[PDB]
Amino acid sequence: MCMKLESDKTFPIMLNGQVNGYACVVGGRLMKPLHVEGKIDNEQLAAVKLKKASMYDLEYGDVPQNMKSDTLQYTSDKPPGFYNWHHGAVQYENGRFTVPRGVGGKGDSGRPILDNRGRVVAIVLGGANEGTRTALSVVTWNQKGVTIKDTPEGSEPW
Amino acid sequence: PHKVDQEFQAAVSKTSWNWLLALFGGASSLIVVGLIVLVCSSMLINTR
């Protein structure tokens, strides 16, 4: 499902020995986290100059020629729950993105949460295991469409 | 000899106090503007 859908668009970030994060091509924007350190792969999308955000913990830029393939529409139209994912299915019950136990580790701090129609909805950043079920600190888009952050208590980046 | 002694608060002419205080108040006004826009940025990051 989503594993094939986000393929060749979710470019991983190297820790110089392994992968420590993922980078997304959203609206011509090379979105990668700031806490994820290292060098991004490829050369078409690696030699660009990125601009820090430091309030949303992302970094953005532009692609020179890949606009024909930089096709990941972001959408804030979001019914509450039942969304696909790289690993499984995520739930947006009670206005909060939720995941079952265990899944999610280092190397998985930058991959998108897709829609039912292949539209990027969320870009995961970290998580916390508390309450009834664990929750995620994640950058999304609100009802008005402005970039917003949703973060639990004690949500260290996994 | 002079009947009085010079004072720094007096020997500087009133128009020169006006010019120096005008430049200093301009600098302080731009600092106040910077703190105002920093407060506005804090309001926006509280809003998000």
From Swiss-Prot, chain A:
Where are the residues marked Involved in dimerization of the capsid protein as a site?
Y83, N116
Post-translational modification, as annotated: Phosphorylated on serine and threonine residues.
Superkingdom, taxonomy of origin: Viruses
Segment Interaction with spike glycoprotein E2: which positions? 51-56, 143-147
| Cell compartment(s), UniProt | Virion; Host cytoplasm; Host cell membrane; Host nucleus
**Residues where Phosphoserine is found:** S7
List residues of the Peptidase S3 domain: 9-158
Q: Where is the active site?
A: H35, D57, S109
Residues bearing the modification Phosphothreonine: T10
- Locate the region Ribosome-binding: 1-9
The annotated subunit structure for this chain is: Homodimer. Homomultimer. Interacts with host karyopherin KPNA4; this interaction allows the nuclear import of the viral capsid protein. Interacts with spike glycoprotein E2. Interacts with host IRAK1; the interaction leads to inhibition of IRAK1-dependent signaling. Part of a tetrameric complex composed of host CRM1, host importin alpha/beta dimer and the viral capsid; this complex blocks the receptor-mediated transport through the nuclear pore. Interacts with host phosphatase PPP1CA; this interaction dephosphorylates the capsid protein, which increases its ability to bind to the viral genome.
Q: What does this protein do?
A: Forms an icosahedral capsid with a T=4 symmetry composed of 240 copies of the capsid protein surrounded by a lipid membrane through which penetrate 80 spikes composed of trimers of E1-E2 heterodimers. The capsid protein binds to the viral RNA genome at a site adjacent to a ribosome binding site for viral genome translation following genome release. Possesses a protease activity that results in its autocatalytic cleavage from the nascent structural protein.
Reproduce the free-text note on domains from the UniProt record: The very N-terminus plays a role in the particle assembly process. The N-terminus also contains a nuclear localization signal and a supraphysiological nuclear export signal (supraNES), which is an unusually strong NES that mediates host CRM1 binding in the absence of RanGTP and thus can bind CRM1, not only in the nucleus, but also in the cytoplasm. The C-terminus functions as a protease during translation to cleave itself from the translating structural polyprotein.
Q: What is this protein called?
A: Capsid protein
Q: Which organism is it from?
A: Western equine encephalitis virus
Shown segment, full-protein numbering: 102 to 259 of 1236
